[PDB]
Design a protein around this nucleic acid. Structure first.
Ligand SMILES: Nc1ncnc2c1ncn2[C@@H]1O[C@H](COP(=O)(O)OP(=O)(O)OP(=O)(O)O)[C@@H](O)[C@H]1O
Ligand SMILES: Nc1ncnc2c1ncn2[C@@H]1O[C@H](COP(=O)(O)OP(=O)(O)OP(=O)(O)O)[C@@H](O)[C@H]1O
Ligand SMILES: [Mg+2]
Ligand SMILES: [Mg+2]
Lengths: 93, 87, 107, 455, 98, 107, 93, 88, 95, 455
DNA sequence: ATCGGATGTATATATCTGACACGTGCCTGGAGACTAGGGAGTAATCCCCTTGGCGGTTAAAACGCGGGGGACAGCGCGTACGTGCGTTTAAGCGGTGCTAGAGCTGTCTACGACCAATTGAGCGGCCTCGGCACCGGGATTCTCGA
DNA sequence: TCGAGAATCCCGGTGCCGAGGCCGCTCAATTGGTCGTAGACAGCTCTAGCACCGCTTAAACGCACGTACGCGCTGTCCCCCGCGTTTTAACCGCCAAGGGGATTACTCCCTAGTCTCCAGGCACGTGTCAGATATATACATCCGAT
């Protein structure tokens, strides 16, 4: 049966960052599991925030706050900048 | 010039030497080297920085302006130190 | 009308539709806002780019053109911030950082 | 009944007729088994009528008994000296001092019942409550009654626990903020009679349908004598408001506060009040270090800059000055200013120890009174004390409650003044001080224009 | 001659009497001032609940007491009885927080 | 008919209906089987009973008849099962366990 | 408004265990916190078990498995004893 | 009799002393006390007991009979030790 | 002959540089099966499952030896000893 | 074409006529450019025809060339000695030994092209593949062809990578399990010709519509000569099945396994087989320690208990015994039994080293043959070796594949036996051994009753 | 302190080789259009709880001084461990047979959701009393100088 | 060593306050039907785990040696502890103002549910090149004679 992974997307990002580098399959599995792990962390944190504030909806505000909580230091500010940029562009189109 | 009495020269110094000695004694320590107090203050400051950062994040998300006991409790639980007895 | 992927509208490479579905099928909340998948996909894409860039540099230092778990481990444990992020995480076939305590080294 | 026509024989000195009327009022209340408020104005010998009534209860009805007199800390020596002057035949002492001394006094005298009159401050009462609760008090006398205007105040609660045959209240300013204060006081006086807050409130709901009822209900429970209709031998007070702007430092800091300019600013009110009073109260605005006190103080403070001119002038007129303030730190600033100006102050405050307070008052009321200006604070040293030597009262900064200013200005314009009293209240133009003045005026009109006009 | 205890006895008495009790050991007002000063650097002009500050103090003292127990064990391991900064540093290093 | 509480039917002292509602509004799963609340209620009741008996004994050893956080802390930290369960929990007003290392005791 | 808690239930359990002792308000707040904490732990673990196995239903057997996973040693056996007892009695009536 | 040659007298002894030295050398250790090996074996055995207990619990909840890489991964994540590179 | 210690540093370098597993597959597999017999008899395994267990175990032991070395150096030594291991575990909170 | 009428001059010894026919068959295949399977029965000099054909290719068509002969490890010495006996004029050697010796041999001879015939085992081939892949081989000869019956076996894959002018296969048992094996072998022989698995399968889909087609397709690719229609001089084998029960220990352990009685039991089959063979193969069932070998071994094992009687009896008849088993440990048990019984065994197994194997075989085939019984295993020493000295073959336990038993029993009943061969297969009543016997019988009938009846 | 010679280690090179990147066909999951409904944002209100400073009290903290005991350096003495060598034994890979078990498919069906009505259980409010916290006073115990 | 002596423990007495017990809402849990779909069940199939053996070969194990490292002892000194005095900063209660949190009502707009396509992601071949191995070579380095 079909199993879904983040393989093709991680590969696209890699070819934008290092346009001439490859990644072996074991490392590809490592990156896939890293992506799933961090996704689950952020999603769970947003869920708990929305529950605390007695809301019933996960919005960009909750995702933003969860990113602030989880990612430390410079990663927090850079990631939030990236995400707000993306949502801005998405709404504009 | 009586208006220039003094200031306690910092808030971190408000954690006095005897208070640290009492915390050490509760921990079970008998002799305390004289330099312990300074990095004890440093350690406490770092810990508080982390927790208060988290609690202020929670408060900002809720669009409030008062930090509350529940915000502090959430911050502690997130960092991995659950606290019983405040909600 | 011709179809445009949410990922394309946001100009991402990670898939917004898949993330949206995973959010809605993961029992995280009753409803899911429209911009949550976009914002999350952007964040995951950024983090992956960060790790990949570091690991590619680490590989290139070894005259290698394929990332391997060793390179990923080197990148992560040498970047202190990612190291803090992945403090409790084991990377298979990663190895360890070369580190010898100063006392042991001969006089 | 016993109408007590003339001056007491056993009481020394001659008391004026309205004092006899008040004593008669007290005796009537005592026999009728009701307690009331001797709410006479500031300055008349309320202490004197109280002492006279105690002399009654000792020499006519023959009940020396236990007597408890509660008062602000600063007036305890006043009460002691006065009771030793008018009826120097009663066992009276001040229950004050270190806790060791206090326990010693309790064991010797208080538990030995070797006393007739006990004078204590509020803090001692709330502190030394267990031993005092073991005495079946006959009269509990509370000077400065507006102190218990809140019924949840632990002083109020504790007083509601003593064994008292009867009560009696003194205050020069009975009505402070709203109606509820009166119910608070009366619930202490007659707990059974009233015992109702909302009923009291809605019986009037704050023309003639009420204010007349207001008078009628309290006619027997209160007695007031305005100084204009009773004394008249006293030159009347002369008040004045010296409107001022702000200096450069003041203006700068005032904006800095306004547009929120790493230091904590939460109650903007107090920050603005500090700014208007004197910017040096903010840390660092003073040039330095080194910190020198020569002259930069006066000119960059409109309040003090006007003050120097006025004080120097009055010095050539050769009168004497009282300075009231709301803040102890500003008091320190003023003290340093006189240190520069080579004046002889006699500062009093909330931190000043008891005997130091006594010594300071006696210094300023000395014959030839070596001291020129006397530094006060409206709360600590703004009650009861008898600075009749001076003649000019300067209110540096207004208060949120006007009666706190009335007491302060009346600490000099009282009986045996024999001068003209000039009160110089300082205000700052285009500042919150105007607003606090306005609110104080409304609170004060709510009082004078309604309740005590007939009295 | 006046009565003096040996340099190690009163320490044991303090240990017993402080492990016996439960109250807070840092002075409430100085701790509150410290919390407010720290918190100002993330968002300016915050208000606090009294229970919030009390929770922070509970957690802070609990953390410090645990840290001092670990420090003591390290010092004993090094064959001393006096705890030192190197002992604190090692304890926090082993717990994976430095 | 006449209503009987599910807590009654299972003979419990914790509220089965309330637990069921908390499960259903907590976003734990799309559906909730009927016996899940009963099982969870019984388990919480049992755990509370254990901590309570331990804390009551701890109080009784102090000649006291009301439980306080000190007693709770002693009860928890004196047995390995509950100490391991609550291994990362702070109990306000709990104090610590009386403990002095042996090498510090006088010779 | 109205805040719900486990106060009365913890009081009933205490009056079944020690029919003559008491519990102060801070201690019952602590018990309330403990109950909510352990409830949420078990519920979260059961939820992710059902998710792993691709069910969409939380049932007594996932509660049972989550209990065995959380509670250590002798606690787990007695807890499961008590829970099976309760469900058996419940389904009998 | 060639029947009774020998047995490894345990499985835990299969973790040979040279292997423990190699793990210690990777950990950065230079000189090793001769007693270390027994405590190392005990520590390892305890660790394995915890993880395997959890993995078997997951397995038999799924009503299977085969312990899988994902069962182990969930067990470790439960323990607080996430493992990257084996699915999930 | 090399002096005692030189080869120790050399092999430290070699093993910190490499990445492979250090325990033999069959010994580890037998140990895992024997331990598993005490929870449910007649279990099967996947090769990937046993490899996952070995990865996790070796990582754990390497970390423990790092902390043990830190403790031994703190006690002013170079030889690690069981008391160092026990101290590390207690501080980490595994006791 | 070249029909090669009579016995080769260059080949020593006289070969029987059907051997000449086989040589002619090989020559025909060589000229026609097709490769086939010399699938002659067990026991006839298949090696001899192969050597003869090589002598052809060297002395008639004049191509010494590189020759590669792959065989089981145990038969390498046999091939070497035989090629040195029949045509002692060819450069032949065994590529075996330590890897150091192997590399040395490669560098000296293999890379020096100083060879004509190379004999190697399967493991060496799969190991030493890189240097051997650098030789353009003319003929690659695989003895015991059923070894490559699985096309994913790395031996199969590696053989599918050598540069070979032509191939040739030998096996006494060409068809093992099903049809697919034949396609596997032929895809090695003629990869281009067949190259099809499903087509081969469905061309027949396993009467007359198929089995006749089966014969027709492979008529030129195969050559078989049954011993009955060709030798006509060998005594026929006498087989026997000695049905036995179980002893007390055996019965006890058999149930204990049945109702699952802390040790791992996953393949119940092998556990039951161990039980039926001998319970002492289970650890601890043997009484002790101390462990003594006196007599408790024989009686509590029905297999061995019957064995002792039969072996002792045949000892008085004074014949010689071969013992085949599936398990090396049971072989150890038997060896200890003879140690008690003071017999002279010559055990061989999979762990036995090469020269030890040679020495053992030569010991047992010695004139006067000091040894009585010879211990074997069906896989390791159950192929090719020529133990004609003995006359009684005992199969201790049956195998899942009957041909593995056919080879074992034919290791003694081959040419130059000059005796009567009695094969005693031991079976256990009411045990799985009956089931494995049944399945082996079906697999064997699927073979004999269909494919090779005409051959 | 300095050479000489082993010795380990790093590097360049040619060769497999097997793992990786790429190209193809399918299906299934994502995007579009449309409808309906309920969650959340907004505005108004009010009241309650935070903040700031003062007043009085008083207990703890800071400073200073005397002295002993705990840390640290130095030295000598086993002793335990690292380093080197020869054997064989156990591990590793593969080959075979086999069969249990795990995963896919199609069918009901029993169970859990959804909805409407009603009631009783739980929460907030309001009372008292007993459990505990001082508190003095004597007994006991332990410590430090003998 | 035994006689002061300071700290600790009971212990009875007092008060005090925080626990416990009682009284009205109101809302949320139970009952009763009605659906519809999640999963339990049966059947099939093919795959992957188990057990053994065969064969190779590298690592582990036992043994000997000598050295450097851990440990015990001594001495020094200095630094931290214990104790007394003064004052200052904490604590608690008062007293104002007012910001901000928490409720209520309205409505709208944003999300879900549905049906219809279609294209993007997955599984499956297939060529090929980055890298691991082996070989030889050069180099840094270490430990022992001048
Ligand atoms: N009969 C009298 N003769 C002379 N002086 C009197 C007489 N009665 C009162 N005084 C004056 O009253 C002053 C004492 O203050 P006084 O007793 O008036 O305070 P009070 O207004 O009664 O009460 P409070 O303490 O509230 O002000 C003294 O200076 C004294 O001169
Ligand atoms: N021409 C011959 N003359 C005498 N003996 C022969 C001749 N050909 C074969 N043999 C006999 O064949 C025996 C060797 O075994 P043989 O070569 O028959 O095994 P195989 O059946 O060819 O192959 P496998 O090794 O598969 O059994 C020898 O004992 C030898 O006596
Ligand atoms: Mg007066
Ligand atoms: Mg032969």
């Amino acid at each position: 049966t079909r199993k879904e992974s983040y393989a093709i997307y991680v590969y696209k990002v890699l070819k934008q960052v290092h346009p001439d580098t490859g990644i072996s399959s074991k490392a590809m599995s490592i990156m896939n599991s890293f992506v799933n792990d961090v996704f689950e962390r952020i999603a769970g944190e947003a869920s708990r925030l929305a529950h605390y504030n007695k809301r019933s909806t996960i919005t960009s505000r909750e995702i933003q706050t969860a990113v602030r909580l989880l990612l430390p230091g410079e990663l927090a500010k850079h990631a939030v900048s990236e995400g707000t940029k993306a949502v801005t562009k998405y709404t504009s189109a | 010039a009586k208006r220039h009495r003094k200031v306690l020269r910092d808030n971190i110094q408000g954690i006095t030497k005897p208070a640290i000695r009492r915390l050490a004694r509760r921990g079970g320590v008998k002799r305390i080297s004289g330099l312990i107090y300074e990095e004890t203050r440093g350690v406490l400051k770092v810990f508080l920085e982390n927790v208060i950062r988290d609690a202020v994040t929670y408060t900002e998300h809720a669009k409030r302006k008062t930090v509350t006991a529940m915000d502090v409790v959430y911050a502690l639980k997130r960092q991995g130190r659950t606290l019983y007895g405040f909600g | 009308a011709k179809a445009k992927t949410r990922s394309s509208r946001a100009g991402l490479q990670f898939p917004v539709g898949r993330v949206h579905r995973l959010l809605r099928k993961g029992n995280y909340a009753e409803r899911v806002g429209a911009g949550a998948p976009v914002y999350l996909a952007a964040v995951l894409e950024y983090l992956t780019a960060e790790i990949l860039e570091l690991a590619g540099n680490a590989a290139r230092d070894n005259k290698k053109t394929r990332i391997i778990p060793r390179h990923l481990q080197l990148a992560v444990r040498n970047d202190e911030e990612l190291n803090k992020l992945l403090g409790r995480v084991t990377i298979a076939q990663g190895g360890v950082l070369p580190n010898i305590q100063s006392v042991l080294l001969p006089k | 009944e016993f109408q007590f026509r003339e001056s007491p024989a056993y009481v020394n000195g001659q008391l004026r007729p309205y004092q006899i009327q008040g004593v008669n009022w007290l005796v009537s209340l005592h026999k009728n088994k009701i307690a009331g408020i001797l709410a006479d104005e500031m300055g008349l010998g309320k202490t004197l009528q109280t002492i006279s009534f105690l002399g009654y209860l000792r020499y006519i009805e023959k009940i020396p008994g236990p007597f408890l007199v509660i008062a602000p800390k600063s007036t305890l020596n006043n009460w002691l000296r006065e009771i030793n002057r008018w009826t120097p035949d009663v066992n009276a002492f001040i229950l004050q001092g270190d806790k060791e001394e206090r326990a010693e006094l309790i064991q010797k005298k208080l538990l030995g019942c070797d006393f007739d009159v006990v004078i204590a401050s509020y803090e001692i009462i709330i502190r030394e409550k267990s031993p005092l609760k073991k005495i079946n008090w006959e009269y509990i006398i509370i000077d400065e009654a507006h102190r218990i205007k809140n019924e949840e105040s632990m002083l109020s609660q504790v007083l509601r626990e003593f064994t008292s045959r009867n009560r009696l209240l003194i205050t020069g300013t009975p009505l402070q903020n709203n109606l509820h204060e009166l119910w608070a006081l009366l619930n202490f006086l007659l707990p059974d009679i009233f015992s109702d807050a909302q009923d009291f409130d809605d019986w009037f709901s704050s023309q003639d349908k009420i204010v007349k009822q207001l008078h009628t209900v309290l006619q027997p429970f209160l007695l007031r004598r305005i100084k204009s209709d009773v004394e008249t031998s006293l030159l009347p007070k002369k008040e004045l408001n010296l409107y001022v702007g702000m200096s450069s430092m003041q203006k700068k800091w005032y904006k800095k506060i306004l547009e929120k300019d790493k230091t904590r600013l939460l109650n903007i009110m107090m920050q603005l009040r500090k700014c208007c009073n004197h910017p040096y109260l903010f840390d660092g605005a003073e040039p330095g270090p080194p910190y020198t006190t020569d002259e930069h103080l006066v000119y960059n403070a409109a309040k003090l800059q006007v003050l120097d001119k006025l004080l120097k002038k009055l010095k050539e007129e050769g009168s004497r000055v009282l300075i009231f303030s709301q803040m102890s730190r500003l008091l320190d600033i003023l003290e340093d200013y006189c240190y520069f100006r080579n004046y002889e102050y006699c500062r009093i405050d909330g931190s000043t120890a008891h005997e130091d307070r006594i010594q300071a008052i006696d210094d300023y009321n000395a014959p030839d009174s070596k001291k020129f200006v006397f530094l006060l604070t409206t709360r600590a040293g703004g009650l009861g004390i008898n600075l009749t030597s001076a003649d000019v009262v300067v209110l540096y900064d207004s208060d949120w409650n006007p009666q706190a200013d009335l007491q302060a200005m009346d600490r000099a314009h009282r009986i045996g003044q024999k001068k003209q009293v000039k009160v110089f209240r300082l205000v700052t133009d285009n500042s919150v001080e105007e607003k606090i003045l306005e609110r104080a005026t409304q609170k004060l009109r709510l009082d004078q224009l309604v309740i005590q006009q007939n009295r | 001659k006046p009565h003096r205890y040996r340099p190690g006895t009163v320490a044991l008495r303090e240990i017993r009497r402080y492990q016996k009790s439960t109250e807070l050991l840092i002075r409430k007002l100085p701790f509150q001032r410290l919390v407010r000063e720290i918190a100002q650097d993330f968002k300016t002009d915050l208000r606090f609940q009294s229970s919030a500050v009390m929770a922070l103090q509970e957690a802070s003292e609990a953390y410090l007491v645990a840290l001092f127990e670990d420090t003591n064990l390290c010092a004993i391991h090094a064959k001393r009885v006096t705890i030192m900064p190197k002992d604190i540093q090692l304890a926090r290093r082993i717990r994976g927080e430095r």
